């Protein structure tokens, strides 16, 4: 099953959402196999790119594996997996990595503020609110 999942991940499908769903299914199978750390490692390896990756996911010129770091569904699944498995430091690192790709919506900023407030942090919630205000000024 792992070999088939790796072969499907190495298959350049047309839709990047299909590859994200395959990675999420592999992570769910690993989590059901008591390998949540391995699932988080596989999710991090799927969403692996440089520090300044700017490839557009909507551009139909690159492969779906290359245009997979800007997947909001895979990033949300990785954040949900790491929220109940790791501490607040890894959650902050995942939030910083999501903000580096500029794929975080206002709902993502609200979730980051709620996660900061749940960890007895009010200045960090104000910082996340300032980040949400600065990233999108007028309407959003």
């Amino acid at each position: 099953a792992r070999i088939i999942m790796e072969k499907a991940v190495k298959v350049p499908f047309k839709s990047v959402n299909e590859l994200a769903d395959m990675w999420i299914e592999w992570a769910e199978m690993e989590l059901r196999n008591k390998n949540f750390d391995e699932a988080v490692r596989i999710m991090a390896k799927a969403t692996q790119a440089p520090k300044r990756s700017t490839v557009d996911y909507f551009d139909e010129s690159l492969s779906p594996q290359q245009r997979v770091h800007k997947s909001w569904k895979l990033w949300s699944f990785y954040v949900d997996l790491v929220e109940s498995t790791s501490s607040l430091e890894e959650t902050r690192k995942i939030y910083e990595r999501i903000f580096e790709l500029r794929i975080a919506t206002p709902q993502t900023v609200v979730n980051y503020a709620n996660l900061l407030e749940e960890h007895h942090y009010y200045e960090e919630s104000f910082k996340i609110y300032e980040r949400g205000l600065d990233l999108f000024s007028y309407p959003v």
């Binding site: 769903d21 769910e28 949300s76 699944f77 997996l81 109940s84 709902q107 993502t108 979730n111």
Partner: protein
């Protein structure tokens, strides 16, 4: 087991996708009055006070 280690704050467990604020805004989850909730009862209270003052003057 899959739906046991997730925060369920931004990912929909039924639709298997990201949550959207068009149908489930986060402002309904607040325990206090937001800015949309505020500045509406104060105007109603001011209007009621003005109506009471007008009735007392009449």
């Amino acid at each position: 087991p899959v739906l046991q280690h997730l925060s369920l704050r931004n990912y929909d467990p039924v639709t298997r996708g990201p949550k959207l604020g068009f149908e489930a805004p986060p402002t309904e989850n607040l325990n206090t009055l937001t800015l949309e909730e505020k500045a509406a009862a104060l105007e109603a209270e001011a209007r009621r006070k003005a109506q009471e003052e007008q009735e007392a003057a009449a």
